Enzyme design. Structure first.
Site, PDB file in Angstrom:
ATOM      1  N   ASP A   8     -44.914 -19.261 -54.802  1.00  0.00           N
ATOM      2  CA  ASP A   8     -44.470 -18.489 -53.633  1.00  0.00           C
ATOM      3  C   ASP A   8     -45.742 -18.028 -52.910  1.00  0.00           C
ATOM      4  O   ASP A   8     -46.857 -18.076 -53.482  1.00  0.00           O
ATOM      5  CB  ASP A   8     -43.583 -17.323 -54.133  1.00  0.00           C
ATOM      6  CG  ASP A   8     -43.088 -16.401 -53.012  1.00  0.00           C
ATOM      7  OD1 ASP A   8     -42.732 -16.866 -51.922  1.00  0.00           O
ATOM      8  OD2 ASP A   8     -43.076 -15.172 -53.285  1.00  0.00           O
ATOM      9  N   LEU A   9     -45.613 -17.623 -51.648  1.00  0.00           N
ATOM     10  CA  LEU A   9     -46.764 -17.156 -50.879  1.00  0.00           C
ATOM     11  C   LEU A   9     -46.812 -15.630 -50.909  1.00  0.00           C
ATOM     12  O   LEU A   9     -47.639 -15.053 -51.585  1.00  0.00           O
ATOM     13  CB  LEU A   9     -46.709 -17.696 -49.451  1.00  0.00           C
ATOM     14  CG  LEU A   9     -47.882 -17.400 -48.518  1.00  0.00           C
ATOM     15  CD1 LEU A   9     -49.095 -18.145 -48.959  1.00  0.00           C
ATOM     16  CD2 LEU A   9     -47.547 -17.884 -47.120  1.00  0.00           C
ATOM     17  N   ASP A  10     -45.915 -14.965 -50.201  1.00  0.00           N
ATOM     18  CA  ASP A  10     -45.949 -13.516 -50.123  1.00  0.00           C
ATOM     19  C   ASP A  10     -45.712 -12.865 -51.493  1.00  0.00           C
ATOM     20  O   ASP A  10     -44.766 -13.223 -52.230  1.00  0.00           O
ATOM     21  CB  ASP A  10     -44.906 -13.018 -49.128  1.00  0.00           C
ATOM     22  CG  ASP A  10     -44.891 -11.501 -49.049  1.00  0.00           C
ATOM     23  OD1 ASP A  10     -45.933 -10.889 -48.704  1.00  0.00           O
ATOM     24  OD2 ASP A  10     -43.828 -10.936 -49.368  1.00  0.00           O
ATOM     25  N   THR A  16     -48.067 -11.105 -46.801  1.00  0.00           N
ATOM     26  CA  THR A  16     -47.641 -11.280 -45.401  1.00  0.00           C
ATOM     27  C   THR A  16     -46.625 -10.203 -44.984  1.00  0.00           C
ATOM     28  O   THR A  16     -46.439  -9.972 -43.787  1.00  0.00           O
ATOM     29  CB  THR A  16     -47.006 -12.679 -45.139  1.00  0.00           C
ATOM     30  OG1 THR A  16     -45.829 -12.831 -45.925  1.00  0.00           O
ATOM     31  CG2 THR A  16     -47.967 -13.787 -45.499  1.00  0.00           C
ATOM     32  N   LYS A  45     -36.967  -6.678 -45.536  1.00  0.00           N
ATOM     33  CA  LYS A  45     -37.658  -7.712 -46.320  1.00  0.00           C
ATOM     34  C   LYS A  45     -36.760  -8.858 -46.729  1.00  0.00           C
ATOM     35  O   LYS A  45     -35.732  -8.630 -47.349  1.00  0.00           O
ATOM     36  CB  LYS A  45     -38.233  -7.134 -47.617  1.00  0.00           C
ATOM     37  CG  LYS A  45     -39.521  -6.408 -47.411  1.00  0.00           C
ATOM     38  CD  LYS A  45     -40.157  -6.095 -48.748  1.00  0.00           C
ATOM     39  CE  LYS A  45     -41.481  -5.413 -48.524  1.00  0.00           C
ATOM     40  NZ  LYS A  45     -42.421  -5.679 -49.639  1.00  0.00           N
ATOM     41  N   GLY A  46     -37.175 -10.087 -46.408  1.00  0.00           N
ATOM     42  CA  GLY A  46     -36.425 -11.291 -46.766  1.00  0.00           C
ATOM     43  C   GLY A  46     -35.035 -11.398 -46.136  1.00  0.00           C
ATOM     44  O   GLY A  46     -34.161 -12.093 -46.656  1.00  0.00           O
ATOM     45  N   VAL A  47     -34.840 -10.713 -45.012  1.00  0.00           N
ATOM     46  CA  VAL A  47     -33.570 -10.683 -44.295  1.00  0.00           C
ATOM     47  C   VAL A  47     -33.867 -11.473 -43.026  1.00  0.00           C
ATOM     48  O   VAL A  47     -35.011 -11.504 -42.582  1.00  0.00           O
ATOM     49  CB  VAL A  47     -33.183  -9.213 -44.019  1.00  0.00           C
ATOM     50  CG1 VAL A  47     -32.095  -9.107 -42.983  1.00  0.00           C
ATOM     51  CG2 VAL A  47     -32.764  -8.527 -45.328  1.00  0.00           C
ATOM     52  N   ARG A  49     -34.326 -12.584 -39.122  1.00  0.00           N
ATOM     53  CA  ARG A  49     -34.773 -11.907 -37.922  1.00  0.00           C
ATOM     54  C   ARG A  49     -33.644 -11.198 -37.166  1.00  0.00           C
ATOM     55  O   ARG A  49     -33.826 -10.096 -36.691  1.00  0.00           O
ATOM     56  CB  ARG A  49     -35.459 -12.912 -37.008  1.00  0.00           C
ATOM     57  CG  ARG A  49     -36.374 -12.284 -35.978  1.00  0.00           C
ATOM     58  CD  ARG A  49     -36.998 -13.352 -35.105  1.00  0.00           C
ATOM     59  NE  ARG A  49     -37.736 -14.345 -35.872  1.00  0.00           N
ATOM     60  CZ  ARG A  49     -38.365 -15.388 -35.333  1.00  0.00           C
ATOM     61  NH1 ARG A  49     -38.384 -15.570 -34.004  1.00  0.00           N
ATOM     62  NH2 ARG A  49     -39.000 -16.247 -36.135  1.00  0.00           N
ATOM     63  N   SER A 114     -42.515 -21.757 -50.326  1.00  0.00           N
ATOM     64  CA  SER A 114     -42.391 -20.486 -49.578  1.00  0.00           C
ATOM     65  C   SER A 114     -41.503 -20.679 -48.357  1.00  0.00           C
ATOM     66  O   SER A 114     -41.495 -21.732 -47.743  1.00  0.00           O
ATOM     67  CB  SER A 114     -43.774 -20.068 -49.096  1.00  0.00           C
ATOM     68  OG  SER A 114     -43.728 -18.969 -48.189  1.00  0.00           O
ATOM     69  N   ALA A 115     -40.792 -19.635 -48.013  1.00  0.00           N
ATOM     70  CA  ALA A 115     -40.011 -19.584 -46.783  1.00  0.00           C
ATOM     71  C   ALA A 115     -40.920 -19.370 -45.560  1.00  0.00           C
ATOM     72  O   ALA A 115     -40.426 -19.452 -44.422  1.00  0.00           O
ATOM     73  CB  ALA A 115     -38.955 -18.485 -46.875  1.00  0.00           C
ATOM     74  N   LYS A 145     -33.919 -19.143 -50.837  1.00  0.00           N
ATOM     75  CA  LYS A 145     -33.866 -18.448 -52.125  1.00  0.00           C
ATOM     76  C   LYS A 145     -32.743 -17.410 -51.978  1.00  0.00           C
ATOM     77  O   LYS A 145     -32.664 -16.794 -50.936  1.00  0.00           O
ATOM     78  CB  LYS A 145     -35.214 -17.760 -52.422  1.00  0.00           C
ATOM     79  CG  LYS A 145     -36.392 -18.744 -52.581  1.00  0.00           C
ATOM     80  CD  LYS A 145     -37.724 -18.049 -52.422  1.00  0.00           C
ATOM     81  CE  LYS A 145     -38.863 -19.045 -52.278  1.00  0.00           C
ATOM     82  NZ  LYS A 145     -40.213 -18.421 -52.390  1.00  0.00           N
ATOM     83  N   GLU A 169     -43.452 -16.128 -58.910  1.00  0.00           N
ATOM     84  CA  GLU A 169     -42.700 -15.349 -57.918  1.00  0.00           C
ATOM     85  C   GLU A 169     -42.753 -13.857 -58.212  1.00  0.00           C
ATOM     86  O   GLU A 169     -42.891 -13.463 -59.343  1.00  0.00           O
ATOM     87  CB  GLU A 169     -41.217 -15.768 -57.892  1.00  0.00           C
ATOM     88  CG  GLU A 169     -40.908 -16.710 -56.740  1.00  0.00           C
ATOM     89  CD  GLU A 169     -40.645 -15.990 -55.419  1.00  0.00           C
ATOM     90  OE1 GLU A 169     -40.699 -14.746 -55.337  1.00  0.00           O
ATOM     91  OE2 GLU A 169     -40.296 -16.671 -54.458  1.00  0.00           O
ATOM     92  N   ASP A 170     -42.649 -13.067 -57.158  1.00  0.00           N
ATOM     93  CA  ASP A 170     -42.587 -11.598 -57.258  1.00  0.00           C
ATOM     94  C   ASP A 170     -41.215 -11.045 -56.904  1.00  0.00           C
ATOM     95  O   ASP A 170     -41.027  -9.827 -56.958  1.00  0.00           O
ATOM     96  CB  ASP A 170     -43.597 -10.987 -56.308  1.00  0.00           C
ATOM     97  CG  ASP A 170     -43.237 -11.209 -54.845  1.00  0.00           C
ATOM     98  OD1 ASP A 170     -42.856 -12.320 -54.470  1.00  0.00           O
ATOM     99  OD2 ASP A 170     -43.341 -10.257 -54.062  1.00  0.00           O
TER     100      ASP A 170
HETATM  101 MG    MG Z   1     -42.726 -13.405 -52.736  1.00  0.00          MG
END
Ligand code: MG
Length: 219
Positions: A8-10, A16, A45-47, A49, A114-115, A145, A169-170
């Site tokens: 994963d990135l963030d 980010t 977060k993760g929702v 736009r 990553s998304a 995800k 992943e976090d």
């Molecule tokens: Mg993450």
């Protein structure tokens, strides 16, 4: 031994979430809405736009047209893209550069799952691009995800089955996506958030090749 690591990135490679937060905050200020702080941001977060913008508008009970909604959404994205121009190698999470080097030296495949719509840009700015064997394109995957699709794509892109891979992943949704893909998750953060059934490290400095090997052997 595992043949790939799917990142994963963030929250794993870099932060980010900070820039999304700042961009939503700056939008909100710019139209006179108060209350877009770091606590409120937990609901963003993760929702999507649209959902985020709607939640921010709902603070002030503000009404907008479809044209205005679209322009606001765009303005946040423009602001986000401006803010990530500052990303540098200094923003790579501890342990991650060394881990990438060590994986690479051991011919273990490295993929981004990553998304992030700016994944390639971000890895370039952090000077990590050379370590990555693939970046899964979130535009080419059907579901986000906690669906496993992005991890499946990342594995396949480097010529491995997810069952030959570790996923890092976090987030709860991301751990679930790793699990459902067939890969082995190693979480970073708190078991209170990510579950007691998976191996979790307190921070990314604990993600070492030796630790990943030991986890693989113990599964
Ligand atoms: Mg993450």
């Amino acid at each position: 031994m595992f043949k790939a690591v799917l990142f994963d990135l963030d929250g794993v490679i870099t932060d980010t979430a900070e820039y999304h937060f700042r961009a939503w905050k700056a939008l909100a200020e710019e139209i006179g809405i108060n209350g877009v702080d770091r606590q409120f941001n937990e609901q963003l977060k993760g929702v999507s736009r649209e959902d985020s913008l709607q939640k921010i508008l709902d603070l002030a009970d503000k009404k907008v047209s479809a044209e205005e909604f679209k322009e606001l959404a765009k303005r946040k994205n423009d602001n986000y893209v401006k803010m990530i121009q500052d990303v540098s190698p200094a923003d790579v999470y501890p342990g991650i550069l060394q881990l990438l080097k060590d994986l690479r030296s051991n011919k273990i495949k490295i993929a981004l799952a990553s998304a992030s719509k700016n994944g390639p840009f971000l890895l370039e700015r952090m000077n990590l691009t050379g370590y990555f064997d693939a970046i899964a394109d979130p535009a080419e995957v059907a579901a986000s995800k906690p669906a496993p699709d992005i991890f499946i794509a990342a594995a396949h892109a480097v010529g491995v089955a997810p069952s030959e891979s570790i996923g890092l992943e976090d987030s709860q949704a991301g751990i679930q996506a790793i699990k459902d893909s067939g890969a082995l998750p190693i979480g970073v953060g708190r078991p209170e958030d990510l579950g007691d059934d998976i191996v979790i490290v307190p921070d990314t400095s604990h993600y070492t090749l030796e630790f990943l090997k030991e986890v693989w052997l113990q599964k």
